[PDB]
Design a protein around this motif. Structure first.
Motif, PDB file in Angstrom:
ATOM      1  N   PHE A   1     -22.217  -7.967  13.085  1.00  0.00           N
ATOM      2  CA  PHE A   1     -21.509  -9.221  13.337  1.00  0.00           C
ATOM      3  C   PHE A   1     -21.339  -9.381  14.839  1.00  0.00           C
ATOM      4  O   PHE A   1     -20.700  -8.540  15.477  1.00  0.00           O
ATOM      5  CB  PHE A   1     -20.151  -9.235  12.632  1.00  0.00           C
ATOM      6  CG  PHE A   1     -19.374 -10.505  12.835  1.00  0.00           C
ATOM      7  CD1 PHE A   1     -19.700 -11.651  12.129  1.00  0.00           C
ATOM      8  CD2 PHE A   1     -18.314 -10.550  13.726  1.00  0.00           C
ATOM      9  CE1 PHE A   1     -18.987 -12.821  12.313  1.00  0.00           C
ATOM     10  CE2 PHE A   1     -17.596 -11.717  13.912  1.00  0.00           C
ATOM     11  CZ  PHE A   1     -17.934 -12.854  13.205  1.00  0.00           C
TER      12      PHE A   1
ATOM     13  N   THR B   1      -6.387   2.158  11.672  1.00  0.00           N
ATOM     14  CA  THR B   1      -5.950   1.120  12.600  1.00  0.00           C
ATOM     15  C   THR B   1      -6.636   1.276  13.952  1.00  0.00           C
ATOM     16  O   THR B   1      -7.564   0.529  14.276  1.00  0.00           O
ATOM     17  CB  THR B   1      -4.430   1.153  12.784  1.00  0.00           C
ATOM     18  OG1 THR B   1      -4.021   2.463  13.194  1.00  0.00           O
ATOM     19  CG2 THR B   1      -3.724   0.786  11.489  1.00  0.00           C
TER      20      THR B   1
ATOM     21  N   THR C   1      -4.190   4.965   6.636  1.00  0.00           N
ATOM     22  CA  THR C   1      -4.259   3.591   7.120  1.00  0.00           C
ATOM     23  C   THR C   1      -4.037   3.531   8.625  1.00  0.00           C
ATOM     24  O   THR C   1      -4.777   2.851   9.347  1.00  0.00           O
ATOM     25  CB  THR C   1      -3.231   2.724   6.388  1.00  0.00           C
ATOM     26  OG1 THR C   1      -1.914   3.237   6.623  1.00  0.00           O
ATOM     27  CG2 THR C   1      -3.508   2.718   4.893  1.00  0.00           C
ATOM     28  N   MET C   2      -3.023   4.247   9.121  1.00  0.00           N
ATOM     29  CA  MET C   2      -2.781   4.292  10.559  1.00  0.00           C
ATOM     30  C   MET C   2      -3.946   4.927  11.303  1.00  0.00           C
ATOM     31  O   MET C   2      -4.165   4.624  12.483  1.00  0.00           O
ATOM     32  CB  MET C   2      -1.484   5.048  10.853  1.00  0.00           C
ATOM     33  CG  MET C   2      -0.239   4.182  10.777  1.00  0.00           C
ATOM     34  SD  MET C   2      -0.284   2.830  11.969  1.00  0.00           S
ATOM     35  CE  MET C   2       1.298   2.046  11.664  1.00  0.00           C
ATOM     36  N   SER C   3      -4.701   5.807  10.642  1.00  0.00           N
ATOM     37  CA  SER C   3      -5.915   6.332  11.258  1.00  0.00           C
ATOM     38  C   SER C   3      -7.003   5.267  11.306  1.00  0.00           C
ATOM     39  O   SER C   3      -7.773   5.200  12.269  1.00  0.00           O
ATOM     40  CB  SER C   3      -6.400   7.567  10.503  1.00  0.00           C
ATOM     41  OG  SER C   3      -6.834   7.233   9.196  1.00  0.00           O
TER      42      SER C   3
ATOM     43  N   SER D   1     -21.272  -2.505  10.527  1.00  0.00           N
ATOM     44  CA  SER D   1     -21.266  -3.909  10.131  1.00  0.00           C
ATOM     45  C   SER D   1     -21.900  -4.737  11.236  1.00  0.00           C
ATOM     46  O   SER D   1     -21.508  -4.620  12.401  1.00  0.00           O
ATOM     47  CB  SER D   1     -19.842  -4.403   9.843  1.00  0.00           C
ATOM     48  OG  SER D   1     -19.016  -4.281  10.986  1.00  0.00           O
TER      49      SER D   1
ATOM     50  N   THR E   1      -0.436   7.620   2.062  1.00  0.00           N
ATOM     51  CA  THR E   1       0.268   8.506   2.981  1.00  0.00           C
ATOM     52  C   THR E   1       0.343   7.962   4.406  1.00  0.00           C
ATOM     53  O   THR E   1       0.602   8.741   5.331  1.00  0.00           O
ATOM     54  CB  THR E   1      -0.392   9.887   2.989  1.00  0.00           C
ATOM     55  OG1 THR E   1      -1.759   9.766   3.408  1.00  0.00           O
ATOM     56  CG2 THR E   1      -0.346  10.509   1.601  1.00  0.00           C
ATOM     57  N   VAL E   2       0.095   6.664   4.599  1.00  0.00           N
ATOM     58  CA  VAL E   2       0.270   5.980   5.879  1.00  0.00           C
ATOM     59  C   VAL E   2      -0.707   6.499   6.931  1.00  0.00           C
ATOM     60  O   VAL E   2      -1.397   5.713   7.588  1.00  0.00           O
ATOM     61  CB  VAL E   2       1.721   6.102   6.378  1.00  0.00           C
ATOM     62  CG1 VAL E   2       1.861   5.469   7.751  1.00  0.00           C
ATOM     63  CG2 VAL E   2       2.677   5.460   5.385  1.00  0.00           C
ATOM     64  N   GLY E   3      -0.764   7.824   7.102  1.00  0.00           N
ATOM     65  CA  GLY E   3      -1.624   8.401   8.123  1.00  0.00           C
ATOM     66  C   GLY E   3      -3.086   8.031   7.968  1.00  0.00           C
ATOM     67  O   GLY E   3      -3.828   7.996   8.954  1.00  0.00           O
TER      68      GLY E   3
ATOM     69  N   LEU F   1       0.834  -1.191   0.000  1.00  0.00           N
ATOM     70  CA  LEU F   1       0.000   0.000   0.000  1.00  0.00           C
ATOM     71  C   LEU F   1       0.875   1.249   0.000  1.00  0.00           C
ATOM     72  O   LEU F   1       1.714   1.436   0.883  1.00  0.00           O
ATOM     73  CB  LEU F   1      -0.929   0.000   1.211  1.00  0.00           C
ATOM     74  CG  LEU F   1      -2.298  -0.658   1.050  1.00  0.00           C
ATOM     75  CD1 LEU F   1      -2.178  -2.170   0.939  1.00  0.00           C
ATOM     76  CD2 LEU F   1      -3.201  -0.265   2.203  1.00  0.00           C
TER      77      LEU F   1
ATOM     78  N   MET G   1      -8.235   4.050  17.082  1.00  0.00           N
ATOM     79  CA  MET G   1      -9.482   4.792  17.226  1.00  0.00           C
ATOM     80  C   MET G   1      -9.646   5.773  16.070  1.00  0.00           C
ATOM     81  O   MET G   1      -8.782   6.627  15.839  1.00  0.00           O
ATOM     82  CB  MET G   1      -9.500   5.523  18.565  1.00  0.00           C
ATOM     83  CG  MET G   1      -8.170   6.152  18.945  1.00  0.00           C
ATOM     84  SD  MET G   1      -8.171   6.893  20.587  1.00  0.00           S
ATOM     85  CE  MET G   1      -8.603   5.482  21.601  1.00  0.00           C
ATOM     86  N   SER G   2     -10.759   5.647  15.343  1.00  0.00           N
ATOM     87  CA  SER G   2     -11.041   6.504  14.196  1.00  0.00           C
ATOM     88  C   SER G   2     -12.429   7.129  14.260  1.00  0.00           C
ATOM     89  O   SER G   2     -12.911   7.635  13.241  1.00  0.00           O
ATOM     90  CB  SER G   2     -10.885   5.717  12.890  1.00  0.00           C
ATOM     91  OG  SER G   2     -11.134   6.542  11.764  1.00  0.00           O
ATOM     92  N   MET G   3     -13.084   7.102  15.426  1.00  0.00           N
ATOM     93  CA  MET G   3     -14.413   7.687  15.616  1.00  0.00           C
ATOM     94  C   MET G   3     -15.450   7.077  14.677  1.00  0.00           C
ATOM     95  O   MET G   3     -16.444   7.722  14.332  1.00  0.00           O
ATOM     96  CB  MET G   3     -14.381   9.210  15.453  1.00  0.00           C
ATOM     97  CG  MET G   3     -13.548   9.929  16.496  1.00  0.00           C
ATOM     98  SD  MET G   3     -13.444  11.705  16.204  1.00  0.00           S
ATOM     99  CE  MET G   3     -12.611  11.735  14.618  1.00  0.00           C
ATOM    100  N   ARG G   4     -15.235   5.832  14.260  1.00  0.00           N
ATOM    101  CA  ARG G   4     -16.139   5.139  13.345  1.00  0.00           C
ATOM    102  C   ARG G   4     -16.389   3.737  13.881  1.00  0.00           C
ATOM    103  O   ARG G   4     -15.514   2.870  13.794  1.00  0.00           O
ATOM    104  CB  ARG G   4     -15.561   5.088  11.931  1.00  0.00           C
ATOM    105  CG  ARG G   4     -15.374   6.456  11.287  1.00  0.00           C
ATOM    106  CD  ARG G   4     -14.804   6.332   9.885  1.00  0.00           C
ATOM    107  NE  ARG G   4     -15.676   5.559   9.007  1.00  0.00           N
ATOM    108  CZ  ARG G   4     -15.412   5.303   7.729  1.00  0.00           C
ATOM    109  NH1 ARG G   4     -14.299   5.759   7.175  1.00  0.00           N
ATOM    110  NH2 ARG G   4     -16.265   4.588   7.007  1.00  0.00           N
ATOM    111  N   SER G   5     -17.577   3.516  14.431  1.00  0.00           N
ATOM    112  CA  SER G   5     -17.978   2.231  14.983  1.00  0.00           C
ATOM    113  C   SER G   5     -19.169   1.684  14.200  1.00  0.00           C
ATOM    114  O   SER G   5     -19.676   2.322  13.273  1.00  0.00           O
ATOM    115  CB  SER G   5     -18.313   2.361  16.473  1.00  0.00           C
ATOM    116  OG  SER G   5     -18.714   1.116  17.018  1.00  0.00           O
TER     117      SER G   5
END
Lengths: 180, 40, 79, 92, 138, 100
Positions: free
Chosen positions: B37, B26, B22-24, B35, B18-20, B15, B28-32
């Motif tokens: 399951f 990884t 994907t690392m975002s 999905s 800009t890494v940031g 990949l 906590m991204s304020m998105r729960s």
């Protein structure tokens, strides 16, 4: 200075001294709201003064929504007169004002961060949770809400002199943390 | 028959972002949620 | 590619020189396409980070494998 | 004036007569008696009251809003039939 | 609440929606437990850090990061609206600093990535565009 | 099921007067009129549920309100009613029951 806080709400409790049945009261009355599945008390409102009273089956009533003390007492006497008009042996006794809520404006912005830093033992400022400041005064024991635009809210008082002494005891602190 | 001796597999894709981002994604991204399951 | 996530939370590219000077670990992040399914019994109704992997120098994953002479002199690495 | 109310009344008369005819035959009175029920009923068919059902009644300070569904209203000697309605009343 | 306290003590910035995204604490009881816990800590005796984190979430250069730093401080000095929680001030500050350059993200992508309402970043972008005068660093 | 409030309407009182006319003036069997009233409640219920397209709008001064046994009762003074025409009403009484 020269600013005087204006009262906005007065919460008082009146004990009638009897007992009620709620289907008959809600059936024979005029302006009232009752629903046991949500709140086991009749919400009775009157026009003059524009107040709201919560009437319970144990005789206890809560008259709240008045702008002055005479409107809360006279309104309470009107609710008690309505209860005596329905068909119960009520009696207007134990009238005690439980809460007094007022507000005012200082007409200048207030530094809430510096106020929360200097008076950290009495303030609780969390802008992401509540943009206002919660100042807990010791003497008198008044809870004040200090916003940015200058609107000052005062709650948690039993008399008017506690509100006036709270504003007179908070005015220099607000004048210290001003901006323009 | 000589041509059948040329089977290969795909390599790992790197990949290049800009890494940031994907690392975002990884921690906590304020998105729960988003999905269903094991939600009982 | 090799990367470093600092203490404040910023993650940037890593070079072996700065890796030696900052006492860091020259590694790269690893992700996996994790697929989930729910059966109800054969009735059928994510790029997750799994960990870092240390990368050997002069390898197809390190930045120095594709570098030239002058580029290695820019990155302060002897040819 | 409304023709939809007359159509609804006709559907009600015809449907009621047709569904009641069975109970009229079970009692053993007469078919011409049921015909007299239709003729006298339509002959009789030739105070501002609304009858319906509510879905949500909200109150804010002194403002009342009500969501009504399926009802007949009698206003100024005129009948009306509505599927939805909104009540925005103010209390003193 | 202990993780959030340890975050506030170490000069780190983590939003309530982040720990809330990690643990379902129902917010209200989380706020009360955090309040009484803060009272415990007081009995046993700063939005600027959020900018580089969201700039890392968007992958922005350093000039936009420090530009949103100066914009954040200046907007903290100008008053008007004051904040309405610092998160929206951060996202509208980065929104202005990114509409000053040419790197395109628009409002929908930054609103779905940072979990902010588009009407809120436009509502703040209106008055922010009104105060665009004194926010120029160079 | 099927509430009996629709019997208080104009057509409801007309059917009540017709049935009471058949029972009083003649020798029509009793009890069956109650069956006609139940069938009337069902037909008015399904008919007003499926054969209605109008949408009214009442705006006035709330004079009285009450709630008892899943029954909302309102009394409005000087209210305007909009059909889908505007009609002025000096006094309007509303009686509604729970739809669920």
């Amino acid at each position: 200075s020269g600013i005087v806080p204006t009262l906005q709400n007065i919460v008082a409790t009146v004990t009638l001294g009897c007992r009620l049945d709620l289907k008959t009261v809600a059936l024979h009355a005029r302006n009232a709201e009752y629903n046991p599945k949500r709140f086991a008390a009749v919400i009775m409102r009157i026009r003059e003064p524009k107040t709201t009273a919560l009437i319970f089956a144990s005789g206890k009533m809560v008259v709240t929504g008045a702008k002055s003390e005479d409107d809360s007492k006279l309104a309470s006497r009107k609710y008690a007169r309505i209860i005596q008009k329905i068909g119960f042996a009520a009696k207007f006794t134990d009238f005690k004002i439980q809460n007094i809520v007022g507000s005012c404006d200082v007409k200048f912005p207030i530094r809430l961060e510096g106020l929360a830093f200097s008076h950290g033992t009495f303030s609780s400022y969390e802008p992401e949770l509540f943009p206002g400041l919660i100042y807990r005064m010791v003497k008198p024991k008044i809870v004040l809400l200090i916003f940015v635009s200058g609107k000052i809210v005062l709650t948690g008082a039993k008399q008017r002199e506690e509100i006036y002494q709270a504003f007179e005891a908070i005015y220099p602190v607000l004048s210290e943390f001003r901006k323009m | 028959r000589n041509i059948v001796k040329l089977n290969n597999k795909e390599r790992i894709t790197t990949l290049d972002e800009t890494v940031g981002v994907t690392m975002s994604h990884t921690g906590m991204s304020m998105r729960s949620d988003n999905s269903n399951f094991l939600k009982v | 590619k090799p990367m470093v996530n600092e203490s404040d939370g910023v993650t940037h590219a890593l070079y072996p020189q700065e890796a030696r000077l900052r006492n860091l670990t020259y590694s790269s992040g690893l992700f996996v396409d994790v697929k989930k399914r729910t059966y109800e019994l054969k009735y059928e109704l994510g790029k997750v980070f799994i960990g870092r992997l240390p990368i050997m120098l002069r390898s197809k994953n390190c930045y120095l494998s594709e570098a030239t002479e002058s580029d290695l002199y820019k990155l302060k690495e002897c040819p | 004036s409304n023709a939809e109310a007359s159509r609804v009344y006709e559907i009600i008369v015809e449907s009621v007569v047709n569904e009641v005819r069975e109970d009229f035959e079970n009692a053993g009175i007469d078919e011409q008696t049921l015909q007299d029920l239709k003729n006298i009923w339509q002959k009789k068919l030739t105070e501002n009251l609304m009858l319906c059902l509510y879905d949500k009644v909200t109150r804010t300070k002194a403002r009342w809003k009500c969501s009504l569904k399926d009802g007949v209203v009698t206003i100024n000697r005129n009948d009306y039939t509505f599927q939805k309605a909104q009540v925005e009343a103010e209390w003193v | 609440a202990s993780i959030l306290i340890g975050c506030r003590r170490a000069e780190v910035a983590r939003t309530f929606k982040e720990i809330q995204s990690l643990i379902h604490v129902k917010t209200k009881e989380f706020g009360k437990t955090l309040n009484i816990m803060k009272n415990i800590l007081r009995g046993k005796s700063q939005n600027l850090t959020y900018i580089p984190r969201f700039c890392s979430h968007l992958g922005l250069p350093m000039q936009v990061t420090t530009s949103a730093e100066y914009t954040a401080k200046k907007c903290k000095e100008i008053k008007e609206i004051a904040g309405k929680s610092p998160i929206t001030i951060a996202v509208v500050s980065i929104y202005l600093n990114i509409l000053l350059f040419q790197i395109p993200i628009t409002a929908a992508k930054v609103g779905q990535t940072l979990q902010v309402t588009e009407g809120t970043i436009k509502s703040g972008y209106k008055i922010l565009y009104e105060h665009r005068d004194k926010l120029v660093d160079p | 099921g099927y509430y009996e409030l629709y019997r208080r309407s104009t057509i409801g009182n007309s059917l009540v007067d017709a049935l009471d006319t058949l029972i009083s003036d003649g020798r029509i069997e009793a009890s069956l009129a109650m069956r006609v009233l139940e069938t009337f409640d069902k037909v008015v219920a399904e008919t007003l549920k499926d054969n209605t397209q109008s949408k009214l709008t009442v705006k006035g001064n709330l004079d009285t309100y009450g709630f008892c046994d899943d029954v909302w009762t309102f009394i409005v003074k000087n209210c305007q009613v909009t059909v889908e025409s505007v009609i002025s009403v000096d006094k309007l009484r509303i009686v509604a029951c729970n739809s669920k």
